[PDB]
Amino acid sequence: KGEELFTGVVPILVELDGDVNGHKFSVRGEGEGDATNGKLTLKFICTTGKLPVPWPTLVTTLVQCFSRYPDHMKRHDFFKSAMPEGYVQERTISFKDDGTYKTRAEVKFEGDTLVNRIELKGIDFKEXGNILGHKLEYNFNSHXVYITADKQKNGIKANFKIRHNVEDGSVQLADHYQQNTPIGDGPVLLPDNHYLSTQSVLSKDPNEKRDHMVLLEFVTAAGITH
Secondary structure: OHHHHHOOOEEEEEEEEEEEOOEEEEEEEEEEEEOOOOEEEEEEEEOOOOOOOOHHHHOOOOOHHHOEOOHHHHHHOHHHHOOOOOEEEEEEEEEOOOOEEEEEEEEEEEOOEEEEEEEEEEEOOOOOOOOOOOOEOOOOOOEEEEEEEEHHHOEEEEEEEEEEEEOOOOEEEEEEEEEEEEOOOOOOOOOOOEEEEEEEEEEOOOOOOOOEEEEEEEEEEEOOOO
């Protein structure tokens, strides 16, 4: 029944409060998702000024409920099945040979708007690393997000490796460990093992003066043929 809220194009709000090695910042994004095509489009501004980390390090933290699950996989769409009350999504992102992000977020409906509210904390980053050095290129590759059920917690877990292009031509790895738990107390769908397939395009808004990110994301689900 939750899946029903995601026909049509749904409006999206994203709000993040961040602290990275003591650097505090806020990001706000507005946009729209189309779950049926599994596309999604957003513009994010940094409301506290300059962003102390590279925009791409934030992409995965800044709404998998807009994934496109094929008909034969609708039984395994946890994310929509928890709507409208929503879910909490928590993550540890560990950057190789550098610091760690911790994130805690609520994804839920407020009115007709799908809302993602986030707290981010980063520790142990090196000042001259790829992250606080800003050596990361302003782009993004594709990844598989691997999903499994944790039936004991009435939820799901996900694990995946993000590859950030470094300006020197090498790649910064960031292992993602993810846990999602339903906010409401209805039943939800608890998926068999499967994966999301994701791509992001990052660009700029030729009319914006604020530090910002304009984002396009396509995401589909696979991994269980009939």
